[PDB]
Amino acid sequence: YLTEEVKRGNIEKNVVATGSIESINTVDVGAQVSGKITKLYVKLGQQ
């Protein structure tokens, strides 16, 4: 049972979602021929 003035004020509401960060360019680097792979010129993490 109580009270209060009235602004003169402005809601801005919200809405919560959980999401996940993920790369901008969709990819993978496959292969279509058989064989027995024997050069790898990359290591993981650098352009």
Binding site: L2, G9, I11, K13, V16, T18
Partner: protein
């Protein structure tokens, strides 16, 4: 669910494509409007003192968040409420 999508950058150095984002959007948002805290919610009827013996205040209405609620006639400023009882 349905998916949304964000358009960031990653200059920084890291936002490793694997983490989660607690995302808090916006929707809607009015500028300069009238306030009577939510719990005043009772059609759709209220209560207004005078004096201090309360004489009601039927209204209409919205739009809430997160326990306020814009008030469109009304009800002006400085007045009297009943949040809540």
């Amino acid at each position: 669910y349905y998916y949304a999508n964000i358009i960031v950058e990653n200059p920084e150095h890291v936002l490793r494509i694997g983490m989660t984002t607690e995302n808090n959007i916006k929707i809607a948002d009015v500028q300069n409007v009238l306030f009577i805290p939510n719990l005043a919610v009772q059609q759709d009827k209220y209560v207004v003192n005078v004096l201090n013996t309360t004489q009601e205040r039927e209204i209409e209405i919205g739009v809430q968040n997160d326990f306020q609620t814009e008030v469109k006639s009304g009800l002006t400023e400085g007045e009297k409420v009943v949040i809540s009882q």
